């Protein structure tokens, strides 16, 4: 659960992020299609390659709805709830691909912001993500 | 497992840059924090309930070089990773008790330190190639069970 | 996030279990102890060969902490208050241990309810323990 | 496997007393009905929208047996599993893309299914032995990964 100190860890190192959310919203999906492969067939109408308008259009997208969140920490539900019943009805994406897409942001925010990322904002950004996850895995039904 | 021709450079190569080490005291330290309730099997080490405290203790260090080292004197044995940790996975499973999932837990936890290491080098593609031997490790490990 | 169909079913199927939940919070441990001989460490003072008074007095404590929560599908945390602390920061039990006991409870209502099993009740009481997991290890942080 | 003498007596023991037939399509409508987003790699096999539509589809049934016969046949051959299960490997690996982990909650749903059906004749050791061989059927298909 984000406790005080996860909700100040999280907030306090994305603020750092900045304008390069984007660009880090896409390397992690990039970074996932090509750590496990299983995760590509719910794109067969992306260019999927290194960068084609479609993963950095992506990536800025997830990019933003993370910074909702890291801005609604206290209640996500609300401010998650249609994302959710488009993964967990539309599209039925599997459950365990949040798990490796978590993953590659944290290798992806750890490789650019190396000095932020200390033991406890990685723990805190461990949580997020985390608890981002099981709201957009609620909805199935 | 079986990584390429070409990923079996990209690995070899850059294994050779990352001291070890350290990455092994960061990689168990990061763990211990991160995955609590592990703390458990490492009780012996003395205190472990504040980040700093564990990130510091010299258990924790002495113990991840030497997870590392037999990640590296492993390495390179790919294609037989089964024969590189028999007894060690026996040690694991009869001895330890360990769970297999926290096998995978680790490997995780190894794979982003490097990348807070090499940093930019730490290129997609690399991590494909690491992605597919922690993961071999991992089930070599998980190897002599139930 | 539970419909207010598995709220029913998860009520009905613990309901129609009704006396036999304490044999069944044994049965359970029976079945993961040797299913899982991994889980077995959490008990060495415990004697756990086969229908001993051990295994049988904390298999009807287990079965009743189920009996609370089923009685407060609503707020599920406090229900639980302490047994989450007890688990977490403390025996500081691994979280694959409660998917392991969940199978293995439901296993165990199977083949003493094939009658009253049906999948949807399988698929609600299936929640209810994905629930009482989170919950359990959810003061892991 | 690590299939000792009694285990594999206990676990070939009740083969005989599954019809497959029969568990084949309850076990595979029921991971389609727990897990719905499972649902998705089938989508063609018809109306999936409820307990009903997935147990009476048709369809369900027959894949359901196939299946099953599948891990009958893995069962004649618990000594080798990899090399049997090869040819379904990258059936899923490649074709299917079907996360491995899958692999294990079908196979821990076969055992909450030989249990609704065998009753007693399920006791907390034959399921332990059985355990086991879904892990060796998962760790067989989880195995031309690519
Ligand atoms: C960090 C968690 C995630 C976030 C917050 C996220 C965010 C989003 C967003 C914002 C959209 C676009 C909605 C719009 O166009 O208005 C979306 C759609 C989608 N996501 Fe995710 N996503 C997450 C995880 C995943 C995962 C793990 C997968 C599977 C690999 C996935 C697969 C897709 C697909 C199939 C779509 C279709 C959208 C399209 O075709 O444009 N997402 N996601
Ligand atoms: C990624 C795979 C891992 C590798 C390569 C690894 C390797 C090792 C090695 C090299 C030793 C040598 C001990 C000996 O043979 O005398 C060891 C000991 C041990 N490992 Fe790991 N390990 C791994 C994962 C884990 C995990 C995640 C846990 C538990 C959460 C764990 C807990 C332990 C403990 C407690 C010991 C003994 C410490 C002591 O008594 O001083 N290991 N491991
Ligand atoms: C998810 C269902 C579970 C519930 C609802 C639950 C409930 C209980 C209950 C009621 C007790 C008795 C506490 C007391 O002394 O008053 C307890 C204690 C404890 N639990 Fe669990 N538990 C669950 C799962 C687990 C798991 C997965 C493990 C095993 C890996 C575990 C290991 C223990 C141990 C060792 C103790 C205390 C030993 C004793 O003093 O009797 N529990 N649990
Ligand atoms: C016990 C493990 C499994 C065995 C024995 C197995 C076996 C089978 C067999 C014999 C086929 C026919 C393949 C073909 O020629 O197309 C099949 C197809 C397939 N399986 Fe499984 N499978 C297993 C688990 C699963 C799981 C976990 C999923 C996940 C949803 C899955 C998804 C599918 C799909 C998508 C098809 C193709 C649809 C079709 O042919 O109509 N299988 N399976």
Known sequence: ??????????????????????????????????????????????????GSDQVKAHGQKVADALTKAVGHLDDLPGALSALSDLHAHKLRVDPVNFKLLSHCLLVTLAAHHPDDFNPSVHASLDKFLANVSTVLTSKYR | VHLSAEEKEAVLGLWGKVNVDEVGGEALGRLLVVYPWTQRFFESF??????????????????????????????????????????????????????????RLLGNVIVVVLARRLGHDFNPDVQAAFQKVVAGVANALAHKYH
Chains 1, 3 share one sequence.
């Open chain 1, 1 to 50: 659960v984000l406790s005080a100190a996860d909700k100040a860890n999280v907030k306090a190192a994305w603020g750092k992020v900045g304008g390069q959310a984007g660009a880090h919203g896409a390397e992690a999906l990039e970074r996932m299609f090509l750590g496990f492969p299983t995760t590509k067939t719910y794109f067969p109408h992306f260019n999927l390659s290194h």
């Open chain 2, 46 to 103: 003395g205190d472990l309930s504040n980040a700093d405290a564990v990130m510091g203790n010299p258990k924790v260090k002495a113990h991840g070089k030497k997870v590392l080292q037999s990640f590296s004197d492993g390495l390179k044995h790919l294609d037989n990773l089964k024969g590189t940790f028999a007894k060690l996975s026996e040690l694991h499973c009869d001895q330890l008790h360990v769970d297999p999932e926290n096998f």
